[PDB]
Design a protein around this ligand. Sequence first.
Ligand code: NLG
Ligand code: NLG
Ligand code: CL
Lengths: 146, 146
Amino acid sequence: VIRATTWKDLDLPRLQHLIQSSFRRTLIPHYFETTPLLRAYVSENYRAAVILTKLGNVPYLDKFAVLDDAQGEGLGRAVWSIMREETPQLFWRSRHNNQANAFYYAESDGYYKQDHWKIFWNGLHHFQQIQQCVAHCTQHPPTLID
Amino acid sequence: VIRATTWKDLDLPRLQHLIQSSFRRTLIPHYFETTPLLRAYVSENYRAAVILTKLGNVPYLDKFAVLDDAQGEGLGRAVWSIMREETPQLFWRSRHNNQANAFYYAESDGYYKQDHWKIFWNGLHHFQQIQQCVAHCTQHPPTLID
Ligand SMILES: CC(=O)N[C@@H](CCC(=O)O)C(=O)O
Ligand SMILES: CC(=O)N[C@@H](CCC(=O)O)C(=O)O
Ligand SMILES: [Cl-]
């Protein structure tokens, strides 16, 4: 698994293709130029990725991109596990119909159901911070388009 | 479905057998005499039950007991549905053991994992409330043993 702390250390066209293939949508123009990277974890052959970004006090998991054909080998789970070794606190959002939600239910320490989004987190013991994470997920503009 | 607001309106030995059979554990001595019933929903054949009790300000789902046998999933869902029609707000807890966890993940509006409990809620819209409900669950003695 490739660990990067700058976009310069990744193959960005290949990462864009992974994201677009996984989500079956288009990545917004200038995504890499406008997104403050914290850490990314990308499988060697760009079949699964976890992208952490700066969004408030708690690390934000902005993208969990896993190709449908990488699930038999458990590649997305393996990349997630690598991220978690370094990341005791994090939060993220998910569509209500995301096939990954069963995995998220198992992996998360908490959940809050909102209109658009399921909001998940790990490692947060302060409910003011949890409330703020929920607000960030609701407020943060989308980076997938058509 | 039988709806009861007092333990005297239920067959308690039969209910104890349902609870102990569903959980495959023992119900603590004089559970019924020391548990402040809010209301109970019991299927006619005593193969499924939802027990709401008095714990803080929000209805507390103290036992969801459902036999694995003859459409247990269908029956448990039916009883839960009836309870929810009458119960906009509630909270409850579960062990990672508990068979109903997938159902809880799907039915709840949120959860929070703490000290080997998963704490779930519906209809709570103040993190003030949520935190207090988490506190109640973590403090509340176990009533299943061995
Ligand atoms: C964790 C993760 O992949 N979040 C994605 C979900 C996007 C979507 O489903 O539309 C995000 O951009 O926030
Ligand atoms: C919702 C419900 O049945 N809670 C039960 C069982 C918890 C458990 O051990 O899983 C309780 O006594 O709190
Ligand atoms: Cl996977």
